[PDB]
Design a protein around this nucleic acid. Structure first.
Ligand SMILES: [Mg+2]
Ligand SMILES: [Mg+2]
Lengths: 51, 292, 154, 160, 142, 161, 147, 141, 116, 165, 163, 58
RNA sequence: CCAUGAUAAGGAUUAUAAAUUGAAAGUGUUAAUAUCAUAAUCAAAAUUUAUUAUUUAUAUUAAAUAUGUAUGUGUAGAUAAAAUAAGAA
């Protein structure tokens, strides 16, 4: 949610924490893991598209 | 309505010059022209009317037009005799003489010391003013690549202008001849001056209860959903709807059974189909247009 | 008080020089008078001011009287003396207005604009929620939330 | 004939909080709406700003929407009534006519012959006089009838 | 203009610092197009509705020989990352390539992935005067 | 992807300098300024900050004044009466030769700051506690006003014979 | 006296700022002694926002002419630029003028006091025309720097 | 109007430098983005200082009376669910209706940037002590 | 999951202010009182005129659609999700005459010209 | 209030009568009218500026609609919008062109009818006359530039240019 | 055009452009002249038919004159066709008011809320039950106020569902 | 006076010249010829001024 | 790309009555000197340029995409504008 209406409804469950690397002391994101190599999806295109 | 306030046809000629006095003097010119031509036409019409007032027959056709009603105000088919009809005709012609005379008499008011073409009581046609078109141009007079300030400080104002007079002629009848003179004034207009022609005339329209019938609302109603964007292109036909004028007679059927199925009087169904005396099964029949 | 933010102070004389536009604008002067009257105190300085200024306004489009040259300079000095009198009559008023307004605000549990004194309550200027985190003139750090001058019940 | 402000002040040299002057987007204008228009701080022109917030035409449009809301709001707080759609028969004698739609004809007088001249448009009816019509099902009247004042009765104001 | 960086240097006048009507400046130079926002990430310099289709420029419209760079309003799609094909964009001096593919790009337009004004400056495209003026502003060391 | 250990060309560039100062052209120092209030002189800070008295405040004032009258609190009325008596006395006609100083011409150009800077610094130095042309003190005879609490109407019972 | 013989009404006009304020006063005698002044259908109090220093300007012509304002009914009509509030001194100047001209058409001799007190006199003043050269659009020239 | 001087040529090996610099500016921006999303959500999720300005009414009133009673017994749960973020707090007060028209009109609320402070904030300096490495638009702690 | 994020998916047919989901007893004080406050309250709703009551008026609305009435309270306007104008502004007819300063005119007809 | 809009079908009333909404659907069929389903009931706002006689800007009609977000983008805007065909844009397209007479007739046509021949533009004529004048004194500050070079490079079998000095 | 665009290659397209700028055909009729006996002896437009006509064509009526401006087609001829059609289609629908009362458009009354006088009884609604109950509630309150300093309505008659 | 004192309808603001000219070259009709014979303050009708005429009519 | 012409800006003493506080001395684009070269917008683009009035603390990104940065005692030096429906002697 953007800040205008529902901002307080954001959850910590939205963050993809497993995607990045954090510093213990600061609590800050130092680095980001690579997204593409291990990325598995059953849906490159939407499910209803057969080319 | 009587006097100045009523007419069969109105023409408004909207004259436009680049200079105000141009358009003023053009309006005097054109005005005096239409005064003369108008008086000539309306005088001609007036003599025709005075002759028709003096006497004349009645069309079989005009009489037939008074007598087409299934029921008149007194609740039965009404018989107008030729006398009565001639009397209606005569009354209208009376009114037309008053109107003609009114136009002519205003044509004869505006003499040389006394001419005022602005008031409609004093002249025919008269003239109305119309607020001028004025566009103001704002622009830089400087040519400077270096400073915005110096450009703004040089700013000129000039105006384009266009000036308008309107000539109004109301006539009690419609004459293609007057209309012709009037359209043709565009050929002798003053220098660098143009014009528009507004016409407002009276015209008979005809409402057919046959083509546009008045029926109960449908047994199922229509929602807001038949009104989406592009519903105009997708969910609707153009009015009027096509209702069939031709029906085939089923096997067991009879004149009155067919009339009952089509919603007519049997008389009607026989009149529309007059060629046929008897109707066999599988024959094509004309559906009387009034059928419900 | 709705206008809370830090402000810029103008010297009394320039405030008075606004004449009809602000200092003597009828509308403003009347509600000053209302404040005094309600407190049950004559408004003499306001009335002096209103007199002076009323007349200023009446003749404001006329040219000044013709001056004859004098070695004495008595005329010039008498005009000056009169003028600074009037200036002072109005300083006194301007002072009264700021004075009583601050006092009345103290009674109404009103918080003044930033950096403003209210004699019994905030001696050093009162501040809360400034654009700058310290008190501007003390150079002391401001507490969160905004400091309260009055006990809680309303 | 309102005294309120309908125009946003023109952009100029920065206004500051003074006797006789307040900042442009100060919280006291337009009932604190100016929040929506405000770029706080010593704005660094080159790098920062939100353009629409300094634009005269855009800003004024926003303010005009806000004024419109104010008026609408107050016109609706001003209603004590609902529009009910009542069949032609059951309606009072004054509405048995034809009533041109809004802005179609001349503003129309309710009953010139009975000495009432007022907009039929704005005439409001009492829920109690229309009771028999609006709640026929109910049997016993739901609202008790209005009690009216005798203007011929000797009461305190007639000095008796 | 003072210096001609293109042909138009010859044809155009600057007119000092001149004001144009709101959101019409003759030349669209989007300096802000990469301007980080976490909360506004999906609404800023992107499509006003998420139900809009991707632009013209994500599709091969006609019979092509091939292209040199794709347009900058093209939006970065999972295939841009995965397929491992050349993705170029025209920026200055020459062209920017997306070489190191990330899913974090996905769903934004390449406008937004390409910094228009770099913190990096060539000293060799600068006159000695211009270099002086860049030292005054505290950009170049000297 | 996969955030690298080193950035070759990223941190390479010259760092933008911190600004040394504030206000116009970032060259202004942080120091005490003319706009600064003095809280050590009289009830009003000097120069006085802008103050807006509103009809709202006038109504709150009325209600306070009323509630005070009905609880028979005479004290704040008396403080107010005192304040008023002190500062409202009629200022004395100045002696010939006495005028406020203007700013000398042929010092700075007419559009220069110095002009205002002078005015402010003058009025800053003359605080209302320094106004000698208005006669405040215990010494002062005040014909227009009542002297103490005992002379005001809520004392009326002692005025009776 | 130029007066409508039937309605007994006289008509004056005020101006200020050449455009902004054009008013027209319809002035008629009230025999019941309850007179009232009304502007664009609203009572004078409301229209001028109860500000006295505006309304007394509209009182002045009845004074100068040595008349009792209560013997007269007036309605003023705004023919200029309309605005939600006309309470301000310039508009009031125009009002006063309209009323005074009407009064003069109604009681001819009353013209001599009025003219001497400069009520009927028209000042011609205007805000400067807008013009893009100036910053504020009216009076303020843009910044200058020595080369 | 002087003839425009010609621009010097681009540079040698500056095409490589520009490629690399933009490349890793983008790679950096990924973590700057990741981190600022983390911050934004951490802020939305965590508690804030009370949004209302206690210096005015109906808020000045002793915490055992008036609005505070209305809050402790009827609104408390909701006020805590939304973590005293100033927008939902003000809306809840509108919907409780037992104050009714006052919320916008008589009541005063803290300014935007102050209302955004984390609960527990003691000194004003806190506004300036939040992290500048993160792109939340002041919506970060 | 789209309904979970209210401000995120705005189709370009959607309009502000958003309408809140309905609530059962809310339409008048008697109904509300009966359902929530005092539950043995005999009158379950205030007397409902058998004819149609048009609550938005003059505006006609689609029957059966949950809707809102113009707000009476200032706060209701101020704290709702109504946006401010931000980009350049458009009008379906007036766009053809570009800006107010470029006021395009095909023919120089009097601005007061009247169609016959 | 938040309510359900409601409709009483005339068969159910204790007097049949024609419901205003039903009439509205009639009017929508007749003049084919888009019924915006999502039109918020709360948003009725007249345009104060143009619709109130109190402002100098009073036209009597709602000049703009007061909706902040509204943009040329939206399908709703597209549906009520004046197409550029036969507006002033077309008039500019045709009448404003570099040599205004080329709007009224083919130059060659005109020239050939009026003069016996095509005539060069004034500019061209200037360069022509000048060449003739300055070819008469100096020679060979010149160059030979044509459209098609073959005619000079291989000239016809004849063509022996007169030697010059 | 008689001036400039009179005679050359541009005379054609300018002419056509004026003609298309002028396509509008205004169609008027007074509602007065619609109230006349029809061929069947029934009045063609009566009071109810007129009310229905007015509500159907909204801003298209003024001063008791129905006015349709037909702009749809580039040529005036086609606009009189179009305009005439819409007119008869609108009359066809307005005329439904002669089929019976169900088609007579409703009257819109502004009906006041209940008055002050009515609203006064709101405080007596269920008077007996409420007094009898408030005595029990007073017991509940007296008891609850031995335990705790402040007794909320939510401990007495108000229900608030916990989970 | 810069130009003869005559009803201004006789004057035209010149194009390209800062000056007015007469739309009938050099002929001049006096004020008396605009109004009716012996018209008080040359006036269409003597009873009222322009505004007086308007509101009487209304 | 050498290849003449022409319109800007720039207050300093013809004043009050029935009356204007903007000027000729020339600011890219315009008509007789030619004898290196296709450089021109129809989108989405690269800051060094004297010549520019920005929103400063109750509520803050919805339609063409639209600016992330500088809180620092209203604080150096040096500069800008105005006597015109306003109020200055
Ligand atoms: Mg030159
Ligand atoms: Mg080309």
């Amino acid at each position: 949610n953007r800040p205008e209406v529902a901002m307080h409804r954001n959850t910590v469950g939205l963050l993809p924490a497993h995607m990045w690397e954090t510093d213990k002391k600061t609590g800050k994101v130092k680095s980001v893991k690579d997204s593409v190599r291990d990325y598995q999806t059953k849906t490159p295109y939407p499910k209803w598209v057969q080319l | 309505e009587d006097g100045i306030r009523g007419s069969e046809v109105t023409y408004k000629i909207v004259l436009e010059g680049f200079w105000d006095h141009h358009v003023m003097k053009l309006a005097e010119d054109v005005c005096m022209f239409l005064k003369d031509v108008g008086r000539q036409i309306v005088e001609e019409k007036l003599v025709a009317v005075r002759r028709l007032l003096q006497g004349g027959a009645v069309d079989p056709e005009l009489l037939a037009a008074f007598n087409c009603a299934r029921a008149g105000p007194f609740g039965g088919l009404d018989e107008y005799d030729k006398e009565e009809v001639a009397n209606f005709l005569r009354s209208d012609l009376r009114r037309l003489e008053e109107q003609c005379l009114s136009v002519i008499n205003r044509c004869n008011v505006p003499v040389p010391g006394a001419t005022n073409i602005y008031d409609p009581h004093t002249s025919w046609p008269h003239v109305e003013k119309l607020e001028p078109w004025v566009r103001m141009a704002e622009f830089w007079t400087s040519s400077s690549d270096t400073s915005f300030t110096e450009l703004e400080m040089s700013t000129a104002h000039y105006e384009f202008r266009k000036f308008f007079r309107v000539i109004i002629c109301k006539l009690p009848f419609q004459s293609t001849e007057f209309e012709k003179r009037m359209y043709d004034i565009r050929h002798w207009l003053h220098r660098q001056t143009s014009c528009e022609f507004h016409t407002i005339y009276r015209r008979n329209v005809i409402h057919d209860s046959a083509v546009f019938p008045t029926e109960h609302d449908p047994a199922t109603p229509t929602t807001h959903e038949h009104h989406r964007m592009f519903s105009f292109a997708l969910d609707w036909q153009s009015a009027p709807v096509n209702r069939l004028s031709t029906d085939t007679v089923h096997e067991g059927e009879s004149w009155d059974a067919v009339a009952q199925r089509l919603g007519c009087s049997v008389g009607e169904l026989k009149d529309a189909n007059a060629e046929r005396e008897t109707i066999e099964a599988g024959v094509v029949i004309n559906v009387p247009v009034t059928a419900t | 008080n709705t206008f809370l933010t830090s402000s810029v102070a103008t010297p009394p004389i320039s405030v008075i020089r606004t004449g009809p536009k602000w200092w003597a604008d009828p509308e403003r002067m009347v509600r000053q008078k209302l404040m005094y009257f309600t407190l049950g105190v004559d408004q003499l300085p306001l009335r002096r001011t209103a007199v002076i200024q009323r007349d200023l306004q009446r003749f404001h489009m006329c040219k000044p009287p013709p001056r004859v040259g004098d070695s004495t300079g008595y005329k010039r000095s008498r005009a000056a003396q009169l003028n600074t009198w009037y200036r002072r009559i109005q300083y006194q008023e301007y002072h009264m207005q700021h004075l009583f307004t601050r006092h009345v605000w103290g009674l109404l549990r009103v918080y003044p604009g930033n950096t403003t004194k209210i004699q019994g309550k905030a001696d050093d200027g009162y501040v809360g929620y400034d654009s700058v985190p310290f008190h501007r003139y003390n150079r002391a750090p401001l507490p969160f939330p905004a400091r309260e001058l009055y006990e809680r019940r309303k | 004939v309102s005294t309120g402000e309908f125009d946003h002040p023109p952009f100029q040299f920065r206004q500051r909080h003074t006797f006789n002057t307040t900042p442009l987007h100060d919280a006291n204008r337009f009932g604190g709406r100016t929040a929506y228009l405000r770029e706080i701080g010593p704005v660094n022109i080159k790098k920062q700003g939100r353009r629409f917030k300094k634009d005269p035409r855009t800003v004024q449009f926003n303010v005009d929407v806000w004024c419109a809301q104010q008026t609408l709001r107050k016109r609706w707080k001003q209603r004590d009534w609902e529009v009910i759609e009542i069949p032609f028969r059951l309606v009072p004698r004054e509405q048995q006519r034809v009533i041109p739609e809004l802005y179609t004809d001349i503003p129309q007088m309710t009953d010139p012959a009975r000495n009432d001249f007022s907009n039929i448009r704005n005439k409001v009816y009492d829920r109690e006089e229309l009771q028999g019509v609006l709640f026929p099902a109910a049997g016993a009247m739901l609202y008790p009838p209005l009690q009216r004042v005798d203007k011929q009765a000797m009461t305190l104001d007639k000095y008796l | 203009l003072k210096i001609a960086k293109s042909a138009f240097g010859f044809y155009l006048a600057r007119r000092g610092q001149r004001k144009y009507p709101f959101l019409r400046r003759p030349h669209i130079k989007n300096t802000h197009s990469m301007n980080p926002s976490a909360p506004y990430f999906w609404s800023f310099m992107t499509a006003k509705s998420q139900m809009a289709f991707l632009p013209e420029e994500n599709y091969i419209t006609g019979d092509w020989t091939g292209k040199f760079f794709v347009s900058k309003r093209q939006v970065y799609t999972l295939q841009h990352a995965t397929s491992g094909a050349k993705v170029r964009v025209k920026s200055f001096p020459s062209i920017f390539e997306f070489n190191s593919p990330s899913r974090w790009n996905i769903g934004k337009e390449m406008n937004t992935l390409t910094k228009p004004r770099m913190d990096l400056i060539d000293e060799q495209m600068l006159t000695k005067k211009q270099r002086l003026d860049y030292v005054r502003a505290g950009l170049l060391p000297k | 992807t996969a955030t690298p250990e080193r950035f070759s060309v990223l941190g390479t560039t010259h760092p933008k300098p911190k600004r040394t100062g504030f206000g116009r052209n970032n060259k202004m120092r942080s120091k005490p300024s003319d706009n600064v209030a003095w809280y050590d002189k009289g009830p009003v800070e000097w120069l006085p900050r802008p103050v807006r008295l509103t009809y709202d405040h006038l109504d709150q004032l009325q209600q306070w004044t009323m509630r005070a009258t009905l609880d028979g609190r005479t004290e704040e009325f008396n403080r107010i009466r005192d304040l008023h008596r002190e500062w409202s006395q009629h200022p004395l006609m100045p002696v010939l030769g006495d005028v406020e100083p203007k700013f000398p011409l042929n010092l700075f150009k007419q559009n220069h700051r110095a002009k205002k800077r002078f005015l402010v610094r003058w009025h800053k130095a003359n605080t209302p506690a320094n106004w000698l042309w208005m006669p405040r003190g215990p010494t002062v005879v005040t014909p227009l006003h009542r002297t103490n609490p005992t002379q005001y109407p809520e004392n009326w019972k002692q005025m009776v014979q | 006296a130029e007066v409508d013989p039937e309605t007994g009404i006289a008509v004056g006009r005020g101006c200020a700022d050449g455009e902004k304020y054009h008013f027209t006063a319809l002035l008629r005698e009230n025999r019941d002694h309850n007179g009232i002044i009304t502007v664009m259908g609203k009572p004078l109090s409301l229209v001028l926002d109860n500000k006295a220093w505006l309304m007394e300007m509209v009182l002045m012509p009845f004074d100068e002419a040595n008349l009792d304002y209560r013997d007269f009914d007036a309605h003023i009509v705004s023919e200029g630029h309309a605005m939600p509030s006309i309470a301000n001194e310039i508009a009031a100047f125009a009002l006063r003028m309209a009323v005074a001209n009407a009064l003069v058409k109604l009681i001819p001799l009353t013209r001599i006091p009025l003219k001497k007190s400069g009520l009927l006199s028209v000042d011609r003043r205007r805000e400067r025309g807008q013009f893009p050269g100036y910053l504020d659009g009216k009076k303020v020239k843009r910044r200058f720097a020595k080369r | 109007w002087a003839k425009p001087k010609k621009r010097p040529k681009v540079g040698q090996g500056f095409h490589e430098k520009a490629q690399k610099w933009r490349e890793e500016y983008l790679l950096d921006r990924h973590r700057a983005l990741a981190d600022s999303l983390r911050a934004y959500v951490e802020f939305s999720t965590s508690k804030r200082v009370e949004p209302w300005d206690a210096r005015f009414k109906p808020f000045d009133r002793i915490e055992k009376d008036g609005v505070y009673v209305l809050m402790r017994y009827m609104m408390e749960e909701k006020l805590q669910l939304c973590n005293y973020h100033h927008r939902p707090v003000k809306r809840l007060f509108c919907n409780i209706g037992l104050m009714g028209p006052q919320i916008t009109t008589k009541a005063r609320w803290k300014p935007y940037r102050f209302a955004t402070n984390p609960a527990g904030t003691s000194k004003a300096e806190r506004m300036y002590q939040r992290d500048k490495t993160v792109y939340t638009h002041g919506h970060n702690d | 999951n789209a309904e979970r994020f209210p401000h995120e998916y705005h189709t370009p047919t959607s309009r502000f202010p958003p309408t809140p989901s309905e609530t059962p007893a809310t339409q008048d004080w008697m109904a509300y009182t009966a359902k929530y406050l005092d539950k043995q309250f005999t009158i379950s709703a205030e007397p409902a005129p058998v004819y149609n009551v048009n609550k938005l008026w003059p505006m006609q609305q689609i029957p059966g659609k949950v809707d809102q009435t113009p707000f009476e309270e200032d706060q209701t306007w101020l704290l709702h999700s109504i946006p401010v104008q931000q980009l350049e502004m458009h009008h379906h007819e007036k766009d053809l005459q570009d800006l107010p300063f470029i006021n395009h005119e095909q023919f120089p007809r009097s601005l007061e010209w009247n169609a016959p | 209030g938040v309510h359900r809009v409601g409709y009483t079908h005339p068969s159910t009333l204790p007097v049949p009568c024609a419901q205003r909404w039903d009439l509205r659907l009639a009017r929508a069929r007749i003049f084919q009218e888009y019924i915006e389903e999502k039109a918020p009931g709360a948003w009725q706002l007249e345009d104060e500026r143009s619709m109130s006689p109190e402002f100098k800007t009073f036209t009597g009609y709602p000049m703009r609609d007061m909706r902040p977000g509204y943009g040329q983008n939206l399908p709703d805007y597209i549906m009520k919008k004046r197409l550029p065909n036969n507006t002033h844009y077309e008039l500019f397209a045709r009448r404003d062109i570099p040599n205004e007479d080329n709007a009224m007739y083919g130059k060659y046509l005109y020239d050939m009818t009026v003069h016996g021949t095509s005539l060069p533009s004034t500019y061209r004529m200037h360069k022509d006359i000048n060449k003739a004048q300055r070819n008469d004194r100096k020679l060979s500050g010149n160059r030979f530039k044509v459209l098609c070079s073959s005619g000079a490079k291989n000239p016809p079998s004849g063509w022996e240019p007169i030697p010059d000095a | 055009d008689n001036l400039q665009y009179k005679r050359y290659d541009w005379q054609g397209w300018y002419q056509r452009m004026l003609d298309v700028h002028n396509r509008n055909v205004s169609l008027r009729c007074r509602i007065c002249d619609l109230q006349r006996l029809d061929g069947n002896g029934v009045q063609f437009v009566d009071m109810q038919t007129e009310r229905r006509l007015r509500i159907l064509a909204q801003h298209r009526v003024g001063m008791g004159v129905l006015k349709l401006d037909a702009d749809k087609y580039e040529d005036q001829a086609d606009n009189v066709t179009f305009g005439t059609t819409k007119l008869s289609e609108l009359l066809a629908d307005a005329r439904k008011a002669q089929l019976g009362e169900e088609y007579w458009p409703s009257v819109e009354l502004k009906v006041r809320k209940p008055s002050g006088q009515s609203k006064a009884h709101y405080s007596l609604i269920d008077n007996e039950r409420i007094e009898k109950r408030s005595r029990e509630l007073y017991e509940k309150y007296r008891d609850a106020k031995k335990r705790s300093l402040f007794v909320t309505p939510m401990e007495t008659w108000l229900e608030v569902k916990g989970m | 006076l810069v130009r003869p004192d005559v009803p201004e309808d006789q004057y035209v603001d010149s194009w390209y010249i800062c000056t007015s000219m007469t739309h009938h070259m050099g002929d001049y009709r006096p004020w008396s010829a605009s109004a009716p014979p012996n018209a008080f303050r040359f006036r269409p009708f003597n009873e009222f001024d322009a505004k007086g005429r308007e509101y009487v009519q209304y």
